[PDB]
Symmetry: C5
Subunit: 103 residues, 5 copies
């Protein structure tokens, strides 16, 4: 089993690690139909998304999706420093697959 | 897929962006029959609501609505500054569709 | 659709507004059978309850009962000032229908 | 309907009030099979548990049990002062039936 | 029945206690398929995981698994001190079974 975000990220196709070492700059949440998702940017301008759940996700992923949204929300509110992001780069904005936070 | 709230709002009918750049002034919550909802106001008098889930709403929108309510409560509690709100102006108060918070 | 708590409270039978403008003094919670409920009081001795969900309530009522409880707990914990409460006066202690918070 | 924890506790068999007026000393949580439970202690050594959900518990019970766990966790983390506990004294450690918190 | 994490940990095969008395150093969360899990680290390098639900778990443990993730998440964000962890040492990284926190 992967021991860290890096090795975990390397297990899938079209992924890439982004090292931020910075807190989240803005948080956006949408309840609009077909656009039920969350978006975040950082000071440098990088923008990321938590994908609207769809056909490319199995049941275990749907719940993990809801948890990831809870997570970003509280991290943003408490101004926590996000270290790294493992994202799928074949989408725009890049879709978040994993996150790590280190004080 | 939109990169921001403005473009996202631009994807629906009867929507509209509101720049507040201010923390929520009042938060109201009701559990009364058929009026299970939340209402927020800003110091300028601006008043918005999170629509009572309805027949039209599907499961995805339903839990999105639940999350928004959670979002408004904690944001109000943390005095988090809200930047913009994308609302459906064909209702009174205007219903919230999306929200953005900055730093 | 109503825009504030006083106007909302006025749409039902046997309700009333209690103006508090003060934080909750104590929070009580129970998991005992038939009394799975929460109770709060204010320094002035005022006491209120969130009804135990019954047969009368539909699931949308039920979910709202759940949220109110969450709301009260976190309100108590953050020491937020509660402004007004819309309550059913046909019960004892008076049962909560809606709540508003503002500073 | 009871208005305080003492009166509510008095409605059952084999219960008892414990007055603590102190914050939680430690919090323990387990996911191990048949031990999916929470245990809390106070500085004076006192120890209490939230029973593992079982067959006797109706939806309202199990759900109330899940809530009690969220409550104790957050009470612990925020260092909230626990006033009294209503517990079943025919179980070791004594099992929590209700809780009250005051400043 | 068991009063502490040590005794509880003792009821299973392949377990072991780790006394840490320190705060979580990094927190990692993933929503990738078959990797819907969490991983934590402590300053000395020690790594632990919450296992992806599997056939070795029942619905009761599945709930508890979601709860443990929420727990690790707030503990981290709040820099709470974890005292001990009961883990399964037949896996890599070590799988968390129970956790104790004390100021
Ligand atoms: C790259 C891709 O299209 N992935 C989609 C996936 O397709 C399957 C194979 O991809 C992997 C992968 O993503 O790397 C292979 C991994 O080892 C799998 N790992 C595990 C632990 O299961 C994952 C995993 O199944 C998915 O990520 C879960 O959603 O899938 C893909 O390579 C394969 O297609 C080959 C084909 O076999 C070969 O003959 C041909 O020559 O080349 C193809 C491309 O390499 O086909 C597999 C399906 O039959 O399928 C899932 C849905 O079932 C998704 O569509 C996944 O796409 C990504 O989904 C992400 C969410 O999980 C996210 O939205 C990304 O943005 C999507 O591209
Ligand atoms: C050690 C093990 O194999 N555990 C798996 C379990 O197997 C059962 C027996 O082990 C216990 C244990 O873990 O100590 C026995 C406990 O008394 C049980 N306690 C309670 C309250 O129920 C637990 C419990 O069932 C599991 O932890 C739940 O997942 O299981 C194991 O000894 C046994 O096989 C014996 C056999 O009976 C004996 O004749 C033979 O000669 O020696 C064998 C090995 O000592 O069989 C039991 C199952 O038939 O079964 C469950 C599935 O039901 C899991 O697969 C469990 O594996 C662990 O699961 C953990 C998560 O809960 C975690 O992932 C660990 O990493 C897994 O190893
Ligand atoms: Cl009884």
């Amino acid at each position: 089993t992967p021991q860290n975000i890096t090795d975990l990220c390397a297990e899938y196709h079209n992924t890439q690690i982004h090292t931020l070492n910075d807190k989240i700059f803005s948080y956006t949440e949408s309840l609009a139909r077909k656009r039920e998702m969350a978006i975040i940017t950082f000071k440098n301008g990088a923008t990321f998304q938590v994908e609207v759940p769809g056909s490319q996700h199995i049941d275990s992923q749907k719940k993990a999706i809801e948890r990831m949204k809870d997570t970003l929300r509280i991290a943003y509110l408490t101004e926590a420093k996000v270290e790294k992001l493992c994202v799928w780069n074949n989408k725009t904005p890049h879709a978040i697959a994993a996150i790590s936070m280190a004080n």
